[PDB]
């Protein structure tokens, strides 16, 4: 759905032997908090000897974009399962927020590699601070000075079944 980014902090259940266990945090993209907590345990069980019944969620907080109205170049690292094997992949997305870039990324993976949501791990999302560090040409072509382009062959929308003149595609 429409993705939100949450920080989720968890811990192991306190014991007499080990009071005050370590606090672990990660950033999760999800459509709501219920899915976000479920994803937290999914990745935590891949890194530490712990599960939901043996731990607790300390705090979950939504993270908002610092400058949501600024165009940014994002570099994304992903790991996904194909029909035969697992692969790592780096892609670049141009958007105005992290959640917007992540939503585009899932659409791109589904369209070009037929990868569903369950088959994708988001490794890292980072904004590229400087030009010439962009390494994909389909993103670099929008960084040219004084970029202009037309929109040829405009197709207008008709609210009536019949029209009394031949339409034009001028723009």
């Amino acid at each position: 759905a429409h993705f939100k980014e949450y920080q989720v902090i968890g811990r192991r259940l306190p014991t007499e032997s080990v009071p005050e266990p370590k606090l672990f945090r990660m950033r999760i993209f999800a459509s709501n908090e219920v899915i976000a907590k479920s994803r937290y345990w999914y990745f935590l069980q891949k890194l530490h000897k712990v599960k939901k019944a043996s731990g607790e969620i300390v705090s979950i907080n939504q993270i908002n974009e610092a400058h949501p109205t600024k165009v940014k170049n994002f570099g994304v690292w992903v790991r996904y399962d194909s029909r035969s094997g697992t692969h790592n992949m780096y892609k670049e997305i141009r958007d105005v927020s992290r959640v917007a870039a992540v939503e585009t990324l899932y659409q791109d993976m589904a369209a070009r590699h037929r990868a569903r949501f369950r088959s994708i791990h988001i490794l890292k999302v980072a904004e590229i601070e400087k030009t010439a560090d962009v390494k994909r040409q389909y993103v670099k072509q929008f960084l040219t000075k004084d970029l202009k382009f037309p929109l040829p062959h405009r197709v207008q929308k008709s609210t009536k079944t019949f029209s009394y003149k031949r339409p034009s595609t001028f723009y």
Partner: protein, 48 residues
């Protein structure tokens, strides 16, 4: 005693629909069943 006194509630289908194309998956996987936490309030009031 107070809870057993109340007869099981007879609700209708939600007025705005279930919000998903397929109910019989878990709420986490885009379905309807399972624990949806505070989101139960929106569903029940639609069915009440």
């Amino acid at each position: 005693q107070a809870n057993n006194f109340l007869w099981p509630f007879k609700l209708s289908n939600p007025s705005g629909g279930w919000g998903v194309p397929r109910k019989f998956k878990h709420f986490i996987q885009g379905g309807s069943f399972g624990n949806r936490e505070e989101f139960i309030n929106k569903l029940v009031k639609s069915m009440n």
